[PDB]
Design a protein around this ligand. Structure first.
Ligand SMILES: *[C@@H]1O[C@H](CO)[C@@H](O[C@@H]2O[C@H](CO)[C@@H](O)[C@H](O)[C@H]2NC(C)=O)[C@H](O[C@@H]2O[C@@H](C)[C@@H](O)[C@@H](O)[C@@H]2O)[C@H]1NC(C)=O
Ligand SMILES: *[C@@H]1O[C@H](CO)[C@@H](O[C@@H]2O[C@H](CO)[C@@H](O)[C@H](O)[C@H]2NC(C)=O)[C@H](O[C@@H]2O[C@@H](C)[C@@H](O)[C@@H](O)[C@@H]2O)[C@H]1NC(C)=O
Ligand SMILES: *[C@@H]1O[C@H](CO)[C@@H](O)[C@H](O[C@@H]2O[C@@H](C)[C@@H](O)[C@@H](O)[C@@H]2O)[C@H]1NC(C)=O
Ligand SMILES: *[C@@H]1O[C@H](CO)[C@@H](O)[C@H](O)[C@H]1NC(C)=O
Ligand SMILES: OC[C@H]1O[C@H](O)[C@H](O)[C@@H](O)[C@H]1O
Ligand SMILES: OC[C@H]1O[C@H](O)[C@H](O)[C@@H](O)[C@H]1O
Ligand SMILES: [Ca+2]
Ligand SMILES: [Ca+2]
Ligand SMILES: [Mn+2]
Ligand SMILES: [Mn+2]
Lengths: 237, 237
């Protein structure tokens, strides 16, 4: 049992993708998770992009957990340095058929009213009360309060290469963040037991959010674009 | 307690480094682990470079183990494609005052008639009987038979950026290998309990080796140069 897909670019109305909320595919093939009008990112925006088909991360019959690798490129342009860009984007895994959660610092994956489990890798750009300095990469399990975090310096408008890998045998989830133009490399890892937090079948995808109106700052925004995305999972059995 | 050092280049007669065997610092700031005469790598060569001062990875009094991060750049030029370049270079941690071990596939860190413990990250370029395909990154603990391995494609003569990170809390050792010219990223991780394999005080450094005479192949060689090296360790004790 080994699923696998890759998108070297995105075509309008991708039959393979499921767009939610403000997420849209631009004319030139980029996946814009958050609203951007006339080259200008907007606040009060939230969008998700899920891979249309559910993937099986573990089998209850055998007890086996899948290993997976996912690579993608993103770009975050922060047009307004003052007072503070927000909020960031995440790659996540959650039960199938979920609805967009709260925006702002919750990236659209956390729903306080009705919480669903989820594992996510965040690229946080706004410092909430529960956050260490930003920007930072964080590993989230059922909460936006990261288990592990590492700070990084964003290449404004530049391209970012990300590699997220999970080894079922060691239960190690390690992510690598590289900004090819700056030559900088950021790494973070932690132990996560998928079998323990997620159901056998899940959805994989992205979610992003810009400044929440409650913050009263229209400048709290930025773009959250995804240029490419490949995914591979291998469930032995 | 925190320790750290940085080398943006290397200077001849460096007081902070301890060179062993064939290791020498070139006129233009590169650390040549293995012998190279007039722009040509030689076989039957072995060299190590250790950081002059010992570092404390764990404290017996508190039982605490240190976390550390090390970044370095290396270059391996393989002039003779046939029959097979050899053998590779490694970054290692060992008890202080050890001497260069056997060359060839032992990289100079393993001494059969007087084994000492060690944790090492290898960049193997020659396939010994105990090796999977090469080149490959491997995590070695007391043995050249890696616990975990990952294949990679070398950028012949190109520059390679490496990031090795160890988190005491999770005991996760993760290494990242990036070839900026090719834009390729390789990642590997494993669990290693330093406190369990190493003494409180250790030496950190590099070791490399070229084809062993027993192989009767003079072309079994390559360069093993290190361009830069930074280190940082944190013992909350
Ligand atoms: C919201 O983002 C705007 C775009 O960055 C800021 O406006 C720009 O602020 C500059 C100083 O930071 C100023 O030199 C520019 O002229 C101005 N751009 C224009 C013409 O709109 C804005 O900054 C505040 O509001 C503007 C109108 C000026 O009064 C600035 O002095 C203020 O700092 C950002 N708002 C906040 C709350 O920072
Ligand atoms: C050892 O490395 C040498 C450098 O590449 C090899 O010789 C080179 O072989 C090339 C094709 O194999 C040829 O184009 C080059 O002219 C030659 N370089 C020189 C000047 O020596 C060598 O290959 C062997 O020796 C040469 C002379 C030929 O007889 C080949 O057929 C041989 O394979 C390499 N030897 C080994 C052990 O592979
Ligand atoms: C944020 O986006 C939502 C859509 O998800 C808009 O409805 C919000 O507009 C505000 O609230 C609505 C209900 C209506 O009262 C409108 O006039 C308001 O502006 C929008 N929030 C803001 C502050 O723009
Ligand atoms: C290999 O090197 C050692 C010492 O560096 C030397 O004594 C020996 O003669 C060399 N062997 C060959 C065949 O070059
Ligand atoms: O002003 C922006 C700011 O608004 C609120 O404080 C949200 O909780 C933050 O995450 C951020 O969106
Ligand atoms: O020919 C080169 C080859 O020689 C022997 O087999 C060594 O054990 C190897 O590590 C390598 O040096
Ligand atoms: Ca935040
Ligand atoms: Ca080998
Ligand atoms: Mn955060
Ligand atoms: Mn090996």
């Amino acid at each position: 049992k080994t699923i696998s897909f890759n998108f070297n670019q995105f075509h309008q109305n991708e039959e393979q993708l499921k767009l939610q909320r403000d997420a849209r595919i631009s004319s030139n093939s980029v996946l814009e998770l958050t609203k951007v009008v006339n080259g200008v990112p907007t606040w009060n925006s939230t969008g998700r992009a899920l891979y249309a088909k559910p993937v099986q991360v573990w089998d209850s019959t055998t007890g086996n957990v899948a290993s997976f690798e996912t690579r993608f490129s993103f770009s975050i342009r922060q047009p307004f340095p003052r007072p503070h860009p927000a909020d960031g984007l995440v790659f996540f895994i959650a039960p199938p058929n979920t609805q967009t959660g709260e925006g702002g610092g919750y990236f659209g994956i956390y729903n306080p009213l009705s919480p669903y489990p989820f594992v996510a890798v965040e690229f946080d750009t706004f410092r909430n009360t529960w956050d260490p300095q930003i920007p930072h990469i964080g590993i989230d399990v059922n909460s936006v309060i990261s288990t592990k975090t590492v700070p990084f310096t964003l290449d404004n408008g530049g391209i970012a290469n990300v590699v997220i890998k999970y080894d079922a045998s060691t239960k190690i989830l390690h992510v690598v963040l590289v900004f090819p133009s700056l030559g900088t490399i950021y790494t973070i890892a932690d132990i996560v037991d998928l079998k323990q937090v997620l159901p056998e079948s899940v959805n994989v995808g992205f979610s992003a959010a810009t400044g929440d109106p409650s913050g009263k700052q229209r400048n709290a925004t930025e773009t959250h674009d995804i240029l490419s995305w490949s995914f591979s999972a291998s469930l032995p059995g």
